[PDB]
Design a protein around this ligand. Structure first.
Ligand code: HEM
Ligand code: HEM
Ligand code: HEM
Ligand code: HEM
Ligand code: HEM
Lengths: 309, 309, 309, 309, 309
């Protein structure tokens, strides 16, 4: 009966990520537009319903204490800035996240055009990326991106909250991280060195052998084993973006998870690293620019918001 | 375990609606063809299975008392002709409704060709429309049509009968209404006047503001609030048709619902109107030509029909 | 919670069937690659995820007694060679079956390239067919092939094992039969004679009338009635193959079922035939070349194999 | 025998416009990359040849006097900045124009990535727009854009230079103009007022009646009659761009023509206006930001450049 | 007025190559079927005309002296077997070549089925390959294949014979070479070594720098400069094939050219090699299995064959 937000969707060829911070004293203006979002999605994306326009509304901690009364999600907190040994993962202020995805750029652009002008003057858009998609789902590093997202049962228990928090049954936690990795050192790097970086191959994306794969690789550090033996997986819709006029080539990481402890332990395996391997090899090239922790509610939660405190 | 008929399907670019009345004393001839319909669908539509040929067999009240013994659907009755103040909603006799939908016209045409000639001589086809589909799901009025159909849970409880009638768990009620609205007055009418008619915009189909939207608009009158606060929604596959040789430009309305009280209250909000607003603004231009109330059974019900009385 | 293998998938325009026998003393080499198969599928098919690359790993009886300890599937046995009156259904040795299916030939070819070279030297590929797909899902006989596969509930209870064997809840049994039917006698045969062979029409694939359809037709002999009145259905992904350089025109039959008693009774209705009709009319033209009985496990069963005996 | 650059191509769903100015003393570095451009196009766009990756190299006046010796195109000059009565058409310095167009964003992005890093350090990219494409070829104004481009003979004599300049037989002249029109006043404007602005309708893009169409409309001012009676047409690939984080909604105008006198007379009919109508109605909303006049050579001219002076 | 055979066609996702030798005394039987080929192409490929079924009939030297009277093509000769220093290029007997290409495998298979059974008993099919196509036009080596085929004027003068032989104005010469390159040594070879082999990159197929590219690379040896300065190009539709049951992974090379001196000088640059570089680096891995020189006539030449001698 709790219908979740469309996070369990395939990767789309175009995507728009919008991190907008809410201005002071403009609570009820966003409280108007928050039930209107699914109406705008069904209004716009029904023009070409075979484009699969799907918005993912997400709300941070500050926007939760401002906008909503009653309960609170249990692990919803501001994104812990990870000041590691060499690489730092910053956290810019962002109240709400609009994650838009469809088959083409225009319908995402029009949904975002109608989104901020349903709450005109209430928000300033802090982060504006138009994430496109490479040839066979690659990123700018050249490796195929996101091939280990689960499906079915191993995905709905990976993302959707059950009754471990029954007031928010259904719903995820989001970690956006806008990277801006350089290509000057990455392109001069050779391919087998880059496969030591990633942990899988580049052309065919075969995972490497367990003894051949180094301990500080990305696919080596991001896999998380529990003590019972089950592995915890997240679903990430990482879409590359970039502007050649500034020479920017970045991959907008965005990870959906049942609890932010899993994503934060992955980020601890990357930035803080393992106690053997204290650095992740992709962070030698990728520097995070933005960061934020958010919460997806159900679409019923946007349909029936709790009253404004 | 009751598999419903494929009503929960997206809008297809071509559609064929058949309202055929059963001749006198030809009961067992249709009783032969009624289990054969899903076999014909799987037979024809498997040629190009990425055309999604899907028939929706529907049965009226007279064909229920003739064809089937045992129980009866609780609210199945002949379509109440709504003789309002100015606009009248007539009800031509039609026993069964064949609703066909697929990606192209030809496979719907061939399924309909095999449908009446599986029961040859038993029926006369009263109403023959070949509903095509406009650019971005528009109708002949120019507005995008059917953008507020629900999905998922809010659709299956909107259409499929639970155990409030347990002998027909799964199954809908159909209201066909073949409109023949004129374009001479509609085209000379200006756009903003037409947005007062509809209640949403024309180009981008944004719903208007609640104070800006007039009370006699279509989207204003057709949304139904209950006393608990939930809204009752129906699913409609309205497909435009037309013949320019007669100058006909019509939209074949067809609405699927869990109970005909909801659709009939929508028709009462349109023709009879609200006690404040006694006329719906689209009925100034749209005159209904046909009308009928039908019942979708399950496909198991066509597989296992009750014995012929 | 048991996730089955992707057998409930639509027919794809290209398919690769691999019947590879395991060499002596190479048990642990295949035991390495058997958890790696879903990883290779998610690795390769994520390049163009709208190609739907889906492998179906299947294991015969000999490979079960060699590879796996613990329990055994209840009806898993070597494929009983049917030496009928005139037509014989042979059974070549084959340990495991790799059934690959996607929208194009190349990604199936690359998955098969990575499959045998994940277990290099451990297997010899006995049977190598590249099954393509005709115009509207036809076969080389000219008839539309596989139009009576069930969907939904009538398919999951047709294929997936419940708790009648609770140690293998979810999982099917496979009957491959590589036919090599001649076209010289079939093409000189007239159309209506061929519709007596099949039991359905050729151009539009309408099923024939029950009195018009002969008793020795294919669609007449292969439908199985039980004593309670329900019919037992299987799901078959029959893909045509062929080599004109040898003049070969064959249809690689492959049938998935909940229990091999159903498929074996269909084969008894074909080769042994009915006690009235002892021959199936398509076996006058189709001679089986290969044969094998296999078992699909769950993908969890490949993820968590029982320990190697 | 002179093969022109691919200007006679249909409008593509994604486009990248690059206006890069050449740094001082970096002439031979661009002289290396200028024959390499068609090689890079055939190298990258052959991956998915059904994406139609097509670059249009264009060279301004300064880059012509720097890069090329020998002759000069007859009307090639710096873009005359039109300081009208109210609206001004500026001209930023830009040496060369890279016009990229294909079915998707990624292959244009990769061609542009390889374009500046074939001449690394020689150029600074002044203008960086990623032009996407709306629903039915619309722009951000909502009107269908570019429906009056000619085809066939009326297009090749509209764009390609014959032997009126025989040293550059084949080749066009380009007028880029990056507009940044506001949507706050345009959206509050009503639709029939906007049809007075454009001169055609908005939903169906029917051209208005000749008496109904005002004299200061866009389609009224931009059609140019000669004294013999023929009309001079240009081909424009106007692609919308925009950034909602700055609130930018612009249409990157780019017009290809046989001679810049035609495009400049169109710009004089817009900014300077007619002596009756001195303002074009779309310039009330559209303010030009950039501007430049360039020259397309043949691809043979890039294959065989004249020697560097 | 001479319409050439459809050699100037894009690379198709499926292809069938058929090298059939004509039996002794079966001249008039092939002389019947040779005008019937374009009729069979228009007959079969018009079913789905958006599959682009296109046959390329080719005739060797022996079939020319047997089948046709009158003139002879000037350079038509049996394929000179190149017995180099280490690699040998053999030449199996093959009279005619049937090159079939379309969007899918089935219509090529059906055209080939109707081709040999229009001349039943007159031919034996010596070579039977079903060439499929990799992800982004790659081959089994992993490199993108055929990205330097010309287009337009530089292609029609590269392939079609003018009036240097006016009796066969229009028409090409074909060099088929079925390679069977091993993957065991190629896969263990590293990427940059393979880019020394090819001469271009692997992932993005950028051509290497002229000083970085070695002299014995494939792209280094196969480009042919003339003494006037123009380069002679051929058009090749190289399609990969293979059978994993034998472990075969081959690329069916097929090259169309205006004169076989160009293709033979390319083969001399490969097998015999340059006098500096006597071996081509891809021939370390690729061993030719078959070989043949053929002649494409015009389709008018098949429509109006010269009388049988
Ligand atoms: C710096 C930007 C990043 C890039 C370019 C990147 C790219 C990739 C690539 C290419 C892979 C291998 C293919 C696949 O399995 O997805 C991968 C794996 C993965 N990435 Fe990332 N990634 C980035 C950051 C992150 C972050 C910040 C997280 C989570 C905190 C993350 C989570 C994962 C996980 C969980 C896997 C799969 C590990 C396994 O297969 O179980 N990535 N990433
Ligand atoms: C006269 C022919 C009709 C036309 C041309 C028409 C067209 C439209 C259009 C353009 C909309 C707005 C877009 C959308 O929300 O669907 C709409 C809304 C709707 N129509 Fe109709 N309609 C017609 C008759 C009917 C009838 C007879 C019914 C039911 C008895 C009906 C039920 C609805 C409902 C329920 C809505 C949506 C209200 C809301 O959004 O909740 N319509 N129709
Ligand atoms: C000799 C090669 C075979 C060919 C060419 C072939 C082809 C066909 C065709 C054309 C049909 C009718 C269309 C459709 O309903 O699928 C059909 C029906 C069927 N075939 Fe086959 N078939 C072959 C062998 C088999 C085998 C070996 C089995 C199972 C043991 C089998 C099981 C069935 C079943 C169950 C049906 C449907 C009967 C009904 O509709 O309920 N077939 N086959
Ligand atoms: C300010 C940005 C501009 C926008 C949004 C715009 C948009 C449009 C639209 C919507 C049309 C009508 C549909 C069609 O015929 O193309 C049109 C027509 C046209 N535009 Fe533009 N345009 C712009 C600027 C320009 C400029 C700067 C030129 C050339 C100097 C130009 C040349 C034309 C021409 C020649 C026509 C067609 C007139 C006729 O049909 O013969 N436009 N434009
Ligand atoms: C052994 C099997 C062969 C393979 C796998 C192969 C593959 C390739 C590849 C990957 C390229 C680079 C991409 C492209 O430019 O096409 C290439 C280039 C080329 N190949 Fe082949 N090739 C083979 C044999 C041949 C033969 C036998 C000929 C002609 C006699 C030939 C003629 C060419 C030419 C002319 C080029 C382009 C050189 C230039 O760019 O101007 N190839 N081949």
């Amino acid at each position: 009966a709790p219908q979740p937000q469309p996070v369990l969707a395939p990767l789309t060829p175009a995507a728009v990520f919008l991190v907008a911070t809410i201005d002071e004293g403009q609570e009820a203006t966003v409280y108007d537009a928050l039930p209107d979002i699914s109406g705008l999605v069904r209004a716009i994306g029904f023009r070409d319903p075979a484009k699969r326009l799907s918005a993912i509304t997400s709300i941070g901690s500050d926007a939760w204490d401002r906008l909503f009364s009653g309960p609170r999600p249990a692990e919803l907190h501001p994104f812990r800035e990870i000041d590691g040994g060499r690489h730092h993962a910053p956290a810019t202020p962002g109240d709400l996240l609009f994650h838009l995805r469809a088959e083409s750029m225009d319908v995402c652009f029009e949904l975002a055009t109608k989104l901020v002008e349903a709450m005109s003057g209430a928000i300033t858009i802090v982060d504006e990326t138009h994430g496109f998609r490479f040839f066979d789902n690659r990123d700018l590093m050249g490796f195929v991106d996101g091939t280990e997202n689960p499906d079915g049962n191993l995905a709905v228990v990976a993302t959707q909250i059950g009754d471990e928090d029954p007031d928010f049954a259904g719903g995820c936690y989001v970690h956006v991280q806008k990277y801006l990795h350089d290509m000057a050192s990455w392109n001069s790097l050779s391919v087998e060195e880059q496969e030591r970086v990633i942990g899988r191959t580049k052309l065919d994306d075969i995972e490497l052998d367990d003894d051949v794969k180094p301990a500080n690789s990305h696919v080596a550090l991001n896999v998380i084993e529990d003590e019972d033996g089950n592995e915890l997986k997240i679903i990430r819709h990482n879409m590359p973006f970039g502007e050649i006029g500034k020479g920017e080539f970045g991959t907008y990481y965005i990870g959906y998870s049942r609890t932010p402890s899993v994503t934060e332990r992955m980020l601890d395996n990357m930035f803080i690293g393992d106690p053997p391997g204290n650095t992740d090899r992709i962070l030698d090239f990728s520097t995070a620019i933005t960061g934020g922790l958010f919460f997806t509610p159900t679409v019923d939660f946007l349909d029936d918001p709790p009253p404004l405190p």
